Write a protein that binds this ligand. Structure first.
Ligand code: SF4
Length: 699
DNA sequence: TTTTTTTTTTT
């Protein structure tokens, strides 16, 4: 499988980059990862490879070089998939052009979902049309006019950039802030688009990007897109012709779980309204634009016999679920083991059938309208597209609610009664607990050999959690490799566990935050660190902590206040200037921050990020683990805590020459037996246990 | 055994 010419090509590109790009430094883990990826992707050894490549190993070049070599030899496409658009851009703008220097021949593109692309037609409307005081009837028309004059100028700037190729049309590739509402208007749904009819169709960024996919050697994708391309066999080449690298691979089950997740409203009056609107809309479609294809369900007698039966089912379900909950109150009911009582299951099966039928009708009408008075047709397309979305959520919901198991585990099922607009609304919720069958069918079986890599794949020094969640198995021929970290952590930093007076239990939170803040403040006062990061496991705790350090607002860059890349922008600017700067964030910061040396010398971790015990999904899972005679804490809480802790601690040492401390304020790392195990899955650091000032609680 | 709420993206 590894031909002579291929080894020669990989070696050549390797020597090329190491002695022609300044600072490219070889490493033995890098050589091993190149060889392992090369053997897996050529078919020489087993099926799939899950290789953990800690920061510093040089992971992306390590799979890019053999991946590209094998793709060229075989006239295949290398698909590199990562977690989100920012990481995609990192691969597309930094690593691939670097390889283009030594492979001038290289053909690579990036791929994104339709929703990230501007629609030239709409933007032209927004840039070239007058804001006229929200002309009232015109607002009611929502007829493509800039809300106001500021909006109009911004749109014209965006259009100027688009037309001269300063802007590629992707939402994330422009500096100009775009409101979410604005973006909804600037982009369009597949049906809403004019395709070959539009006078821009040859000029549309999205279609051009897909055209680039077709002749490219490397496509940079995100996991959601790849999954969607495996369900709809529609955007990527045929799986058999694919080399697939799933960078940031630990995210893969969660992404797969989107296919087993739905929440939707089911409250009976609202439902009556929706069905009435739909019936009326189908009749007006038939009158206004007779479709080419008229299904028997569109026949009015049949359509509203169908809708009346659906409604009667919904109303029965409302009554049943309402008996679980106090009247006139917001409430909640979870079904243990995700198991529905027989009558409720029966109802959900019939609902699944009826809502799926309505979804099919709406889809057929929608495609008929899109195939085809442009103004009136577009109003009708929009309404029917809304209807389609409603019934999509419905059929998916009832399909999941009807499942006995998914990948050998229950689907979490539960209802909520929530207040919204002066009223109580009934929601149903389904969340698949395991997703391995999904990954197996869409990826593992479909693509001959896949690389799953990440800086962090293991939990508790083990691939066990990854194996169980992903379905990858040695028995199927998948291999699992953990490369060593290059850095020397014990000499490069320390872990600090202050002598806190309370554990961060539920009752203790107020005192705990107080003690933390005191200690944290003293650290800031030492002026020993310029780059600081504070990491929380809940937004509740983060806000509470923020109340104690309100005198430090100037110094604090808080997740959400600005887009993360801007917050890191400012952080770099101030630290380079000699000022103290503190980032404060949740999971997004714990996962995404990569700050070397001065930029981040002290990491503050409020607590061990254990999963929420009262969450319905966690409860249902623990029930199921119990029924299999496994201990939930051992199998569910502690491994998640280990993975999260590895990731959080992983912010400190990003390079040789990184230095500093990780302050962990959860005393249970020393106080509980499991503490040792969490510490043993971290890199080795010396542990210091300083005394803590008295915690003054605030009103 | 022992634990308590985060986050992107797509058809
Ligand atoms: S093609 Fe669809 S998206 Fe591109 S411009 Fe015409 S309408 Fe807007």
């Amino acid at each position: 499988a590894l031909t002579a010419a291929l080894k020669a090509q990989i070696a050549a590109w390797y020597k090329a980059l190491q002695e022609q790009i300044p600072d490219f430094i070889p490493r033995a883990p890098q050589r091993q990862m190149i060889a392992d990826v090369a053997k897996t992707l050529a078919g020489e050894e087993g099926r799939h490879l899950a290789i953990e490549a800690p920061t510093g190993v040089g992971k992306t070049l390590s799979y890019l070089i053999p991946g590209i070599a094998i793709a060229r030899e075989e006239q295949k496409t290398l698909v590199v998939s990562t977690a989100n658009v920012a990481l995609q851009d990192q691969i597309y703008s930094k690593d691939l052009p670097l390889l283009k220097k030594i492979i001038p021949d290289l053909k690579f593109t990036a791929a994104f979902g339709r929703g990230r692309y501007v629609c030239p037609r709409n933007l032209t409307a927004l840039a070239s049309t007058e804001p006229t005081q929200q002309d009232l009837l015109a607002f009611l028309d929502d007829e493509l006019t800039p809300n106001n004059q500021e909006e109009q100028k911004r749109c014209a700037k965006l259009k100027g950039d688009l037309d001269t190729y300063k802007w590629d049309g992707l939402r994330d590739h422009t500096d100009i802030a775009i409101d979410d509402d604005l973006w909804r208007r600037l982009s369009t749904d597949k049906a809403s688009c004019l395709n070959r009819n539009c006078y821009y169709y040859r000029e549309c960024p999205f279609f051009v990007a897909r055209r680039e996919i077709q002749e490219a050697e490397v496509v940079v994708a995100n996991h959601a897109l790849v999954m969607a391309a495996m369900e709809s066999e529609a955007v990527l080449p045929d799986p058999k012709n694919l080399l697939l690298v799933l960078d940031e691979g630990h995210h893969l089950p969660d992404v797969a779980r989107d296919a087993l997740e739905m929440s939707a409203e089911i409250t009976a009056p609202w439902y009556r309204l929706q069905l009435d609107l739909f019936t009326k809309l189908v009749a007006t479609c038939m009158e206004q634009f007779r479709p080419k294809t008229i299904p028997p369900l569109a026949i009015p007698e049949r359509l509203n016999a169908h809708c009346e039966e659906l409604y009667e089912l919904i109303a029965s379900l409302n009554n049943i679920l309402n008996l679980y909950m106090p009247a006139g109150q917001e409430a909640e009911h979870r079904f243990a083991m995700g198991e529905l009582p027989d009558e409720v299951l029966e109802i959900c099966q019939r609902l699944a059938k009826l809502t799926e039928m309505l979804r099919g009708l709406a889809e057929l009408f929608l495609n008929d309208l899109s195939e085809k008075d442009i103004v009136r047709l577009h109003r009708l397309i929009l309404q029917m597209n809304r209807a389609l979305g409603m019934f999509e959520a419905q059929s998916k919901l009832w399909r999941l609610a009807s499942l006995a198991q998914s990948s050998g585990a229950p689907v979490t099922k539960w209802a909520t009664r929530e207040e919204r607009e002066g009223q109580l609304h009934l929601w149903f919720h389904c969340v698949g607990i395991r997703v391995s069958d999904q990954l197996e069918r869409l990826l593992w079986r479909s693509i001959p050999h896949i690389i799953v890599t990440s800086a962090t794949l293991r939990s508790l020094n083990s691939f066990s959690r990854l194996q169980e969640m992903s379905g990858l198995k040695e028995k199927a021929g998948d291999r699992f490799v953990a490369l060593d970290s290059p850095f020397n952590h014990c000499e490069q930093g320390k872990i600090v566990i202050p002598r806190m007076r309370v554990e961060p239990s539920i009752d203790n939170e107020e005192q705990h935050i107080a003690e933390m803040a005191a200690f944290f403040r003293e650290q800031v006062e030492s002026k020993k660190h310029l780059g600081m990061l504070v990491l929380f496991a809940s937004g509740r705790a983060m806000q509470r902590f923020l109340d104690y350090v309100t005198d430090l607002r100037l110094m604090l860059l808080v997740q959400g206040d600005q887009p993360r890349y801007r917050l890191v922008e400012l952080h770099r600017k101030r630290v380079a200037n000699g000022e103290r700067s503190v980032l404060v964030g949740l999971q997004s910061f714990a996962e995404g921050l990569d700050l070397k040396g001065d930029l981040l010398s002290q990491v503050h971790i409020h607590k061990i990020a254990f999963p929420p015990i009262d969450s319905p999904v966690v409860i249902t899972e623990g029930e199921w683990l119990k029924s299999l005679n496994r201990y939930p804490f051992e199998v569910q809480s502690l491994p998640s805590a280990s993975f999260n802790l590895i990731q959080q601690v992983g912010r400190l040492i990003r390079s040789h020459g990184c230095w500093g401390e990780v302050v962990i304020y959860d005393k249970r790392l020393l106080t509980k037996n499991y503490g040792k195990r969490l510490l043993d899955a971290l890199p080795v650091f010396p542990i210091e246990q300083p005394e803590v000032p008295e915690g003054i609680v605030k009103k």
